[PDB]
Every structure is written in C-alpha cells, then in structure tokens.
Design a protein around this nucleic acid. Structure first.
Length: 86
DNA sequence: AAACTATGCATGCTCTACTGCTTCTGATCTAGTCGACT
C-alpha cells in the first residue's frame, strides 16, 4: 500500500511501518513529514492507482507532439516503455 | 594710594565628531550520505 504512493520507496515505507503508521488515512493526519513528491502522490492517489489505457496514451502523444512541434520544428517523439512492448 | 574688576594665559578633564587599521560575524558556496525516481 505504501510503495504505490508516488515518491515513497521501500526505505520510507519501512520507516513508516516501524513508526506505527499502518493506514493511508494516518498519513494524511500528519502532513508535515512529507516532501513535495509524497504530498503530490498522496493527494492524487486514486487517480494514479487506476491503470492507464491506450486511448489516453494516444491523446497524450498527440498533445506532446503538438507541443514539441510548436516549440522546435522537426522534433521527433517515440513512445517507449511498456506500451512499446505491446 | 588702595581695592575691585576686565582681560588674558596655561593646564587638566570631558563630549563630540571624524579617519584609518584590524578582527569578528553574516552571507555565499562544494563534499559526504541517504533517499526518490527511472
């Protein structure tokens, strides 16, 4: 549960576990020991927990292609990662 | 002719300011460690 939080690794998860933090809500009760990454991940937890689909990939690729084309002409963008493996 | 007072000088103590040299402190910066991510 803790590792899925953006900006939370194994070390931080273990540190929280040994400190008595057991539930997600408990993390929100003390919003003073979390960096920007952890706060951003915890706030948009539900949104980031959902696996992404291919339509969202296409929309994001179109948006980024438009942005790079307007920024610098002739830019080429290639989709890598898991989505390139099928 | 004698006493009082105006004038001045010499010196020590004190406030006040100003200039310059030296030292201390606040501010501007690279190495080590842990952690995040990919």
């Amino acid at each position: 549960l803790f590792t899925q939080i953006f900006g939370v690794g194994v070390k931080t998860a273990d540190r929280w576990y040994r400190e008595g933090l057991r539930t997600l809500d408990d993390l929100r009760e003390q919003p003073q020991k979390l960096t920007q990454q952890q706060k951003a991940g915890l706030q948009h937890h539900q949104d980031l927990s959902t696996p992404v689909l291919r339509s969202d990939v296409d929309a994001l690729q179109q948006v980024v292609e438009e942005a790079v084309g307007q920024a610098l002409p002739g830019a080429t963008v290639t989709l890598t990662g898991g989505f390139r493996r099928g």
